[PDB]
Every structure is written in C-alpha cells, then in structure tokens.
Amino acid sequence: VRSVKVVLVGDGGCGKTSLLMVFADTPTVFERYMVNLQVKGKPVHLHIWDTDASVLLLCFDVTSPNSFDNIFNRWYPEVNHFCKKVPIIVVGCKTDLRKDKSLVNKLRRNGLEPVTYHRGQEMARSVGAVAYLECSARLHDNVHAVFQEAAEVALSS
Numbered sequence: 001v002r003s004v005k006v007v008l009v010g011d012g013g014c015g016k017t018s019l020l021m022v023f024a025d026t027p028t029v030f031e032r033y034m035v036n037l038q039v040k041g042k043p044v045h046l047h048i049w050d051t052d053a054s055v056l057l058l059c060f061d062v063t064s065p066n067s068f069d070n071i072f073n074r075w076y077p078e079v080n081h082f083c084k085k086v087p088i089i090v091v092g093c094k095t096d097l098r099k100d101k102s103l104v105n106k107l108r109r110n111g112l113e114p115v116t117y118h119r120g121q122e123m124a125r126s127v128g129a130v131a132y133l134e135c136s137a138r139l140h141d142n143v144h145a146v147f148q149e150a151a152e153v154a155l156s157s
C-alpha cells in the first residue's frame with residue numbers, strides 16, 4: 001500500500017499550484033494534497049506539498065528565464081544544503097507558451113529566449129537532478145507523467 005512525499009519548489013508564478021490542480025482536479029503556509037496514483041502496476045498514496053519516501057520537484061516557467069536561472073542560483077543550493085540525499089527532478093512548466101509568438105517576441109526584445117528541452121536537460125545535469133520533465137497544466141499535457149516519474153524516482157531511493 002506504499003506511500004510517497006512530493007515537494008514542489010520554485011519561483012512564485014512559475015505554475016506550481018496549477019500543476020497540482022490539474023493533477024488533483026506572518027506565517028509560512030503549506031498545503032498538503034492526498035492524491036492516489038497507479039505506478040508500474042501498483043497503487044501509491046501521494047502526499048503533495050505546495051506553498052517517508054521523498055522527492056523534490058524544482059519547477060520553472062519555460063517562458064521566464066529568471067525562474068530558470070533561479071533553479072541553479074537559488075533552489076539547488078537551498079536543496080543541497082538542507083536535504084542531502086533527497087532526489088531532485090527539474091520540471092519545466094507552461095510548455096504551451098513556447099507556441100506564444102508575442103511572449104517569445106517580448107522575450108526576444110529584452111535579449112532573452114524561451115528555455116528549450118535540451119537546455120532544460122543541461123540545467124538538470126548541472127544541478128544533479130535525476131531527471132528533467134516538461135508539462136503544460138493548461139493543456140493537461142504530460143502532467144500525470146510528471147507525478148508518476150516523481151513516484152518511481154522516490155520509491156527507487
């Protein structure tokens with residue numbers, strides 16, 4: 001009947017809460033969701049945390065180069081200091097917005113560019129992540145896969 005902890009980490013507005021919705025549907029505040037998934041044949045209780053076996057999803061918006069930079073500049077160190085041996089998956093969110101020509105163009109106008117898959121993978125390597133995945137919560141694209149990989153990874157360590 002085995003069980004897993006998923007912590008979502010990443011800049012505000014990078015799509016964390018929305019990822020959770022789609023999948024499901026002054027103090028610090030943490031929200032915990034009890035979601036059931038079937039993984040490699042068998043059922044698993046997920047406990048997902050938003051602001052025993054564990055895994056961290058370091059999230060960024062693929063159309064926000066800042067949120068990307070912060071995976072490395074701000075979240076990797078935080079994760080590496082506190083959590084020691086807890087597995088990391090880098091998740092690129094809002095992949096639907098690469099198709100968005102205006103946003104791309106507004107990026108291009110400030111010298112920036114949308115984060116590509118290949119580059120997302122590089123980030124993953126430079127942060128010691130066990131994987132890199134992408135999804136769009138808007139199009140329900142690949143969202144369950146993210147949390148299934150998450151589960152597989154958490155249980156495999």
Ligand SMILES: Nc1nc2c(ncn2[C@@H]2O[C@H](COP(=O)(O)OP(=O)(O)O)[C@@H](O)[C@H]2O)c(=O)[nH]1
Nearest residue numbers: 011012013014015016017018094096136137138
């Ligand atoms: N286009 C698009 N927008 C999204 C997606 N996921 C979230 N958003 C939007 O991006 C903004 C921030 O979302 P949110 O989930 O609250 O980010 P969070 O603070 O990290 O939880 C909101 O306007 C969301 O509607 C997505 O997959 N595609």
Ligand SMILES: [Mg+2]
Nearest residue numbers: 013016017051
């Ligand atoms: Mg949020």
